DNA sequence: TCAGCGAGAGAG
RNA sequence: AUCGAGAGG
DNA sequence: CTCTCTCGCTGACCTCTCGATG
């Protein structure tokens, strides 16, 4: 039965390779039997003896001495030694991994309303995944007697099973997994919320740990069965226990993109905005004034603030004063937990500032307040990013007015340096470096002019006079807040694309003097494709190196466990400064 | 310009500025032209079947011809057979005509029907035959000294390599075998040491001359010819049976026999040109002079009087198409016949024998049908939309029989080469393991008579550019100076500037007016067909352009076709050349039209003598494609209309009045909305769903076969044990479902509907052989197919019969006899039998059709590499709106634009807003019922806008009815065309916006639909073209609790088709180990898989309300123990 | 081959061996379990 | 007990023993038949056991003493 | 119920003790009638019943007969799962080497003795 | 193919 | 079941 | 004793569709 004969829809059968090698060996061995009885001359016998040892070597390990035997097709047959070794052998395909029951798979979308410990599960999947529990709860209440009545009731989809299912998932966690599992944060435990539809909803704050996106991605779901498994899921793998990385110390749940943009927009300030110069009794008055339409989010005002600080014994002591701030910061102050200073929000916030806020809260207050603080931060960021109406247009990509003069001067310089080569005055290999340096300097000049024109643009009127301030450009705000942009890519958008390289690695003499707002021509576009294809091929053809290295590293050190409490030895190493604090 | 009838109904406005001097060619020439030179008669006998017959032909061959196919394409597709023709050959020994076999035929669009399915043969790019000199750069030896080598490659035969050694010694290899000293081969050609020294020496330097031959002779352990032959024989064939006759024959047949070696005409030409000879013709076999010349050239390169070749140069690789591979396979099949003929010609007989007795047609047919159906280059054709087929038919592959391998291929062959300019697209390529190994043909590219790609250029004479066009190849163009296509010319053809940007010798620079030789023909010469459909491509990054070109081929046709407002101008060419429409063969007047048939009455000056003169077009209705999609044709002409030649009479899938149309036009705003477009999510309105703008039709097939098993015979009947009477309601008296029945999951069709799948029955087919017995429904339906098919043919012939009868009655017996003969022939063709498989009596096939609507979890994309998944369907009173109360359709996140530098998607959004703005102004004028003069004035002002464009439309020559019809067709927006590298500027877009009474920034004020408050900044709103890709969440959701298991390893099966489970691999086990969850790991390893008793105990315990497990031992460990014991090794468990 | 020649024994003291056989790994919530076995040997 | 289990970890001592103690306590209520020491509040046995551990009414020594008393 | 795994070379007596049946010369399943050949690769006597608690001939079809071999067939009545367990053996008519112990980088069957791999391989292949 | 390593003959 | 071809993350 | 030089031998995540052959 370990080498069975499988019937087909037609009369014919499908057989294994082993049954052929056995028959070959049997036939040849029986052929040797007749020769001994007939007393054939040893010349004929010696040929047959060489034959049998050729057959056996095929059955044990085919191809050690090249004589590979094939079948109906021109493909080598598989020996016994081929079924226990390799990537498709018993060890690596059936014993270190396998397929399981109570599992499912689907596409993932976003749910912006969930709490950190929740997930959204379709009820069509949930009904199938939890069938025995429903059968048991049906038999318990007497609604069915046999084991087929419950099956019929579930198949007919009556109106009473939709409450049993709600009762049997109330506090039962599930496991979610994404296919490339690079570290242990690739499997996590959540609590299901029954939804309509066919897609799974995932919390926005857990994407970075999964390396997940909403472009077509998929995910798998598993169900724990025993009490010990449920308690292990709740106490070890639940997403509210995994907030710091195990490879370093920094947190892993961090806001990004829309949340960063929203908080950054609230916490900025302007000059001569509506309602500037008021004195307020607290944050609630600021919220009233903003909602009524009587003040701007960016107005500079005075507000009375109360804060708390911890003493030596661990108790909280209050302190009240008046502070210079803005309406948006006073509004944001209402979600900060007690025990933190007011200076932590009296500035414009970016990615680093928000991450530092979360880390400080965890350091001072503990674990439970941090989850609430993170969820409130996400809600407020989503709420206030939409109210701003931030967009993108073609007029936001501003090109400096001095680009033409710089480019013309560089061209004149490189044209003049050819006169030193027409009449011998420089090495034939020396003009190359001079031209490269000239073009690099011109590129730097153009980039600096563009960035100086973009970052600061106010020309604003303050009570009569003219003043300058940080700009409110959409692209500049996106780059400065740390949401998506980089200063290098704004160069390609509105400066110069720069110098390209040949496929071998040399530098092309003349650069690309066009950005993406004003298009490229055929030659520049043709030149730009070498690097694109090279990068794509590099990405595609060297994931296997990393996979192989990781597998070897896991196999070498897989059996090292902490098995003792104190060794007692006095040895050590001496650490020197990278700061010293980060190293000890 | 004079406009065609199809194009005068809706004229696209063009923004291009450079005049066109050459037309886009027919896009399917590479297949039809190749297959033509395989079956057409060639008196010079050098291309196809004639060459193969003359290359092997005692028996005398006279001629050949091809017969008439038994069935046509449609009947072959319906029945499930191959569309082929018989091959007849005339031989003399007496004169007789014999039968050789069946040759598959190519259809009108460049495909093959093999077993009822359409297939495509992909062209191959491979190394050319000849001689090549190469050298490894380094790392062969630690000394860091380069080594030079030379190789000879024929079309057929064995290889030959010469190479050097770290000690400067010559060595030779045959068929990649072990090395031998070189001079041995010289000794095998009747040369003594004196003659060798005379050949290679005249004196021995140390920098420009070398003693390499003398030292090699020193190391050579041979001094006689026979010693050389025996050494070669021992090296080639171990075993050493040295005989004088054996040694001579091997060397004679190795390189000097016409039946074992062939250096083709192209190989001869390249070989001669590499050695700087004069003639380009010769023989297919080698000679001593050739080998000596190769040795001298290699030695000279070693000395320093030459250079090595580039292996990736596109002048060294050539193209092989289907008409060549078919000939190769036919010759392979033919050489097996002659052995049998020679064997049967030695038995001894006369008089009674005939040529047919010595010919067996099995091997030839076997080889041909193996190639057409089992080759790696014969592929299941891609049929998602019209663009997919065009892209598939124009593909080039570096893999195949004489090709490369995915894993062994390095990095240099996958790169873009400077010689690809104008021949291979540098953008469109797969993104997986096949990157760089699959390519697409450029728009104007061709091949010459040897098989090398070439591209066209304009001749320049005395400083003026003319209209004379020459096709140049990679070798030729390196000796010239070629100017770009965007150079400025005056009315006399002179260059305006004194310095021109030009290409020469693989570099680019500036040249004078009088140093230029040629010029480009177009600005879209370097891209492929798919990449030329992306507007504003020059504002996009190359990675995103690749993504968009690839994703444009996955779109699904919708219920209604909708043209793009912003296009490039290549839609008509693709739509017409694809072959999915109906095109008029001759001009005339429409006589009859309904939903499934068109009749044309031909003009007087296009009729042959003695002809009735009507054309009949039948249309395809609700047929499934290879991807389970829908194919449907719809007429687009009215009764009594005049038609010219080449006009579109009906539309195919994804076509709108003769233009390609893959998606829908949507109103979009760029802004964030409450986290519902967080990463790449898309928020959609409910009005989109209510209007069915992304609803698709899918068709599925199911089969039922009753076996002829001897144990129990089975037949189709209504009676079924243990079923209700309601179950048989949809079944007829014969047990087959009615047409028009609405079924759902778990219903009997022929007794069967797969779980979760619904639909409607639209087609039932019955297949029977020449056997016995028949059913009532088959008598009612299978006979109904034949009677209906006869009725359609009778109706078609009736029109011609009536016309001829009316003409005559104004020799009827001859006409009546002819028409009766035609009817009898049609009936006989329709009444033939079917050849089934043994053990099968009859087959029943059922077709189902279902409709699919969008829902959260479906994938959408544009043309610029932007893709996403739908997250929410929003009520209409929640969407943002404007000052007139108009809401938007789609909301997209701006944060996805600045990181991926695809700026073009913004520019399109600005232009589409302008286009719609024109249509609105027309729409109002049609509601108020104004006079034709005002419409004329406004439309003329609209068509004249631009900065020195080349279109020049004039409406003063239009009739009033024509103007009204154009205005009616223009009332939903004015279409606009912008070529890939010669398009519209920002200033022109702003002028169009101003003409439409819209802001020139492209941004307006919006209000919140839930509170009525105004957003704080202006937002970008416009129109953009969206696509629906074939990744539907209905096909991806799956779940399981318990089911079926495998046989050897008692583990769950895999795959949604067979209700399988998910795989828990090694990396997941590592993750669970790193968590510390031992009980979860043990539960997954045993009781959910491989534990036969534990699984049952766990199930019973769960049903009883007790959550506890009793693990045991997995079965795979027992299997492994038995398997290891079968190798003769004792392995066991130590209980004590 | 080397193991069959030498005649070796395996005590199943690592993670992979217990995974292959199908027992509790000697780490985490299973660690204490293995501590009992040594106490009974 | 809900959302976060950090309270019981500081009382038992480590995460790997809390799972075993909670499972031993919960199996008594689910199958053996026993009454909770806290209001049920419509909870599963695992959550009730975690709540009892958090309050301070359950640990290994108490269960051992009760088992000795029963026999 | 176990605590270690042992591995070692086998001997003819051990292999004979594993087997439930003698050598098997016939080939296959008799494609015409699916019942297996006697004394073959698929054989009911050597390896076990084809169906649960049923004889090949069919004389005994009850649990009361459990543990009884058939006089006319020689087939025991037992659960069919034993077909996954029982093994067999073949009697070679001449000694044959083991490819694993001959071909390797540190060859074993040729390291106990002095001679290298080339000449010993020549001897084994009758040359 | 390409990179890496050990077993085996050489010429001093 | 194996082989070949293609697609998605 | 001890560098050169041939010459083999072993290695390079998850999911879906089609057809031809057993
Ligand atoms: N061959 C491969 N092997 C592998 O082991 N993992 C692969 C993979 N190919 C894709 N992935 C996964 O897919 C993610 C990026 O692919 P993608 O969804 O498009 O997002 P991307 O970041 O590129 O941004 P976008 O294209 O939307 O602009 C990538 O990390 C990875 O997990
Ligand atoms: Mg993704
Ligand atoms: Zn019996």
Numbering used by the authors:
A (entry chain J): 248 to 824, 833 to 839
B (entry chain I): 1 to 57, 67 to 102, 118 to 226, 337 to 885, 919 to 977, 1017 to 1342
C (entry chain J): 1333 to 1373
D (entry chain K): 10 to 80
E (entry chain J): 16 to 142
Extract from the study:
Artificially Expanded Genetic Information Systems (AEGIS) add independently replicable unnatural nucleotide pairs to the natural G:C and A:T/U pairs found in native DNA, joining the unnatural pairs through alternative modes of hydrogen bonding. Here, we investigated how two components of a synthetic AEGIS base pair: B and S, can be selectively recognized and transcribed by E. coli RNAP in vitro. To further define the structural basis of base pair recognition during UBP transcription, we solved structures of three RNAP elongation complexes containing template–substrate UBPs in the active site. Strikingly, our structural studies reveal that the trigger loop can adopt a fully closed active state in all cryo-EM structures.
Specifically, we found that BTP is selectively incorporated opposite the dS in a template, while no other natural NTP incorporation was observed under identical conditions. Taken together, these findings reveal that the B:S pair can be effectively and selectively recognized by E. coli RNAP when dS is in the template strand. To understand how this UBP is recognized by E. coli RNAP, we solved two cryo-EM structures of the E. coli RNAP elongation complex containing a site-specific UBP at the i + 1 site (dS:BTP and dB:STP). To obtain substrate bound structures, we utilized 3′-deoxy RNA, which allows binding of incoming nucleoside triphosphate but prevents nucleotide incorporation. Despite the chemical and structural differences in the functional groups of the B:S pair (in comparison with natural base pairs), both dS:BTP and dB:STP form Watson-Crick geometry in a manner that is effectively identical to natural Watson-Crick base pairs (G:C and A:U). We observed well-defined density that can be attributed to the closed TL for both dB:STP and dS:BTP structures. Key TL residues, such as M932, F935, H936, maintained similar interactions with incoming unnatural NTPs, compared to previously reported bacterial RNAP closed elongation complex structures containing the natural scaffold. Therefore, we concluded that E. coli RNAP can recognize unnatural substrate BTP or STP opposite their corresponding template partner using principles of Watson-Crick base-pairing, analogously to natural cognate NTPs. Furthermore, the high-resolution structures show that, when dB:STP and dS:BTP are bound, the active site of RNAP is in the TL-closed, active state, which is poised for nucleotide addition.
